[PDB]
Amino acid sequence: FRKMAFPSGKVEGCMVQVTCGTTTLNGLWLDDTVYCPRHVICTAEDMLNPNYEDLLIRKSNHSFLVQAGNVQLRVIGHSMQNCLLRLKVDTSNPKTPKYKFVRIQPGQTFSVLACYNGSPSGVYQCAMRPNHTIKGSFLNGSCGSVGFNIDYDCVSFCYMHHMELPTGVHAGTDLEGKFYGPFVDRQTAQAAGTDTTITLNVLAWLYAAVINGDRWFLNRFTTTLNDFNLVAMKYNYEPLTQDHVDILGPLSAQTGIAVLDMCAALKELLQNGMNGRTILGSTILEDEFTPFDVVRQCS
Amino acid sequence: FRKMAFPSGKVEGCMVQVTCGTTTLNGLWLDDTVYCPRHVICTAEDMLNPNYEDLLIRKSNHSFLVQAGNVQLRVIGHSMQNCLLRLKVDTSNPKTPKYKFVRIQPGQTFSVLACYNGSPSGVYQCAMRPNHTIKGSFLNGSCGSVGFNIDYDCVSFCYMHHMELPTGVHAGTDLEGKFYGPFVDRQTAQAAGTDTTITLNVLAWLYAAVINGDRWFLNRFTTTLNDFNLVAMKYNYEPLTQDHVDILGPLSAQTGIAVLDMCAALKELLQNGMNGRTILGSTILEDEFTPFDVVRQCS
Numbered sequence: 113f114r115k116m117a118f119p120s121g122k123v124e125g126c127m128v129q130v131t132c133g134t135t136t137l138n139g140l141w142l143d144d145t146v147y148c149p150r151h152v153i154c155t156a157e158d159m160l161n162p163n164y165e166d167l168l169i170r171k172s173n174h175s176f177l178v179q180a181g182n183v184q185l186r187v188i189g190h191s192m193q194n195c196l197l198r199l200k201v202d203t204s205n206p207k208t209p210k211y212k213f214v215r216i217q218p219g220q221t222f223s224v225l226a227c228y229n230g231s232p233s234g235v236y237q238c239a240m241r242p243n244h245t246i247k248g249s250f251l252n253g254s255c256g257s258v259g260f261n262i263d264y265d266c267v268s269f270c271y272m273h274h275m276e277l278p279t280g281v282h283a284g285t286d287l288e289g290k291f292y293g294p295f296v297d298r299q300t301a302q303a304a305g306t307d308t309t310i311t312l313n314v315l316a317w318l319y320a321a322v323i324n325g326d327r328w329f330l331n332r333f334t335t336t337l338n339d340f341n342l343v344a345m346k347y348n349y350e351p352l353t354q355d356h357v358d359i360l361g362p363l364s365a366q367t368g369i370a371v372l373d374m375c376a377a378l379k380e381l382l383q384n385g386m387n388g389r390t391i392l393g394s395t396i397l398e399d400e401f402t403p404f405d406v407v408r409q410c411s
Numbered sequence: 412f413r414k415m416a417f418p419s420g421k422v423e424g425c426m427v428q429v430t431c432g433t434t435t436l437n438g439l440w441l442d443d444t445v446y447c448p449r450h451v452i453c454t455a456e457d458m459l460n461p462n463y464e465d466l467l468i469r470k471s472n473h474s475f476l477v478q479a480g481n482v483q484l485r486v487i488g489h490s491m492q493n494c495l496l497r498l499k500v501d502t503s504n505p506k507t508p509k510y511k512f513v514r515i516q517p518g519q520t521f522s523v524l525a526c527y528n529g530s531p532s533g534v535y536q537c538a539m540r541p542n543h544t545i546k547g548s549f550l551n552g553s554c555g556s557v558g559f560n561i562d563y564d565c566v567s568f569c570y571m572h573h574m575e576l577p578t579g580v581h582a583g584t585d586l587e588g589k590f591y592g593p594f595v596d597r598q599t600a601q602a603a604g605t606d607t608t609i610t611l612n613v614l615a616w617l618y619a620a621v622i623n624g625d626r627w628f629l630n631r632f633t634t635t636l637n638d639f640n641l642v643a644m645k646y647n648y649e650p651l652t653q654d655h656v657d658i659l660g661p662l663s664a665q666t667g668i669a670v671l672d673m674c675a676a677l678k679e680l681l682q683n684g685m686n687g688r689t690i691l692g693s694t695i696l697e698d699e700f701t702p703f704d705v706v707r708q709c710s
């Protein structure tokens with residue numbers, strides 16, 4: 113039916129306000145550690161060409177203003193962890209959930225908790241683009257906002273926000289501090305690669321459209337899989353592996369609609385276009401729903 | 412930028428599992444009270460033509476299985492409150508936030524917390540339709556899911572889910588138990604009125620599109636306001652009052668684009684269509700963003 117993010121509860125109790133100088137951004141507070149982007153130590157004009165390890169030297173424990181809502185936290189140690197600033201604190205988080213750090217593979221979706229000063233503002237779901245970018249909302253002071261999944265009752269942190277590219281797309285790192293894609297914490301000529309459509313997702317969403325009583329785009333047409341990929345190369349789509357076909361199986365078996373039949377339906381949708389019509393109240397093709405967050409939705 | 416629901420944290424700690432017989436649905440737990448739909452006392456075939464007050468008589472305090480996660484709650488009293496079942500409990504909610512009950516006027520948006528057995532599953536934002544319906548996701552056991560706003564740090568409960576209409580649209584009540592629109596907790600021939608577009612919202616979203624660097628739909632054209640409404644009557648749109656014009660003012664003043672100019676832009680968009688183009692990565696016209704959750708987004 114609708115695009116839905118994960119419950120934000122467990123992550124909300126982890127959001128803190130890390131301020132350094134006139135720089136003030138969000139941070140994640142797990143046990144006696146607080147993570148945030150290492151550019152909090154930078155000033156506006158140091159984002160030109162930054163010497164992070166040397167700037168980090170100027171700083172000492174008293175330079176950081178960690179604020180758990182209203183409780184001000186005593187920072188007892190600072191250390192750089194790639195692009196993230198690791199801060200050992202006095203008082204470990206009592207609200208800390210069971211957590212894991214994951215580096216999600218492109219095409220995978222997660223929920224973002226938008227924060228502006230260490231208190232949550234809103235929550236939405238996006239997807240890791242094949243060119244390693246994200247399409248969210250982040251104005252001033254939103255760096256530090258995290259991205260995550262919740263399986264079972266376990267929080268998998270997989271994103272922190274660092275920068276917006278001069279085209280309106282967003283870039284960041286996992287919780288180890290390592291960037292997704294070829295980007296660096298620096299304001300220089302940094303382009304984004306061409307984006308391709310997450311084919312697998314379009315297919316999964318098509319099944320959800322069928323689940324929901326929208327089946328006009330269907331046909332007794334099938335496709336080889338070798339020919340479909342030619343059509344995909346034509347329309348900036350990701351190609352289809354057998355591994356994509358495999359766990360579309362569960363979805364195929366429910367609706368009794370073969371995967372190759374669904375590709376044939378897609379193939380036609382791209383080639384013919386089928387104007388005026390809407391799939392799940394949308395003319396555009398939706399690639400930000402993984403198979404897993406489709407089975408999960410129903411139910 | 413993106414559609415974003417409110418943080419679910421404060422509401423999550425309020426979700427409980429109210430089961431009665433083979434009927435099991437969600438409930439809201441505030442202080443020593445637990446709310447849920449009064450159809451939990453009904454059996455499958457009692458939804459045909461239900462005699463609620465008479466069925467409620469068959470029930471006593473021991474008939475209800477309230478489950479705060481894993482802690483089973485002792486229900487000490489039952490009473491009907493219009494379409495909601497009010498349950499006085501042993502143990503009042505320690506996680507209860509500051510809360511208010513509101514009956515939002517149509518066109519207003521809120522966040523839903525989807526629940527399936529008294530634990531939160533996902534969260535998304537929708538809008539109260541002019542015909543008093545909602546477009547969300549609710550499979551079996553999702554009745555009891557609530558809708559809400561968070562201003563300040565104060566939770567305004569404004570929706571609970573009751574039923575899906577045989578067209579895929581959703582109907583429910585405020586937290587007083589009074590339905591939105593002409594619907595009743597009963598499986599009979601209950602149609603939905605024709606839906607109209609929330610004009611005011613389209614306008615606010617257009618400003619956000621301008622905020623975000625998308626300004627192709629603009630012109631030095633203006634419109635009387637008396638003529639625009641004629642165009643609106645033509646396209647199943649809500650008409651424009653002076654009260655709509657008034658608090659589009661703040662948005663108008665920021666972008667320097669007059670409201671009547673924006674209506675002229677809309678007027679053209681509906682009449683001409685302007686094919687192929689996308690506004691904020693969408694061809695469809697978006698009416699589920701109120702002015703308030705646009706100013707709030709930025710920022």
Ligand SMILES: *CC(=O)CNC(=O)OCc1ccccc1
Nearest residue numbers: 159252253254255275297298299
């Ligand atoms: C998100 C913030 O409010 C703090 N950072 C910011 O506004 O952008 C600075 C920047 C980071 C990386 C590259 C270029 C500029």
Ligand SMILES: *CC(=O)CNC(=O)OCc1ccccc1
Nearest residue numbers: 458551552553554574596597598
């Ligand atoms: C949401 C539930 O899982 C419990 N109710 C339900 O499935 O629908 C029953 C019903 C309610 C109102 C009108 C008709 C049928």
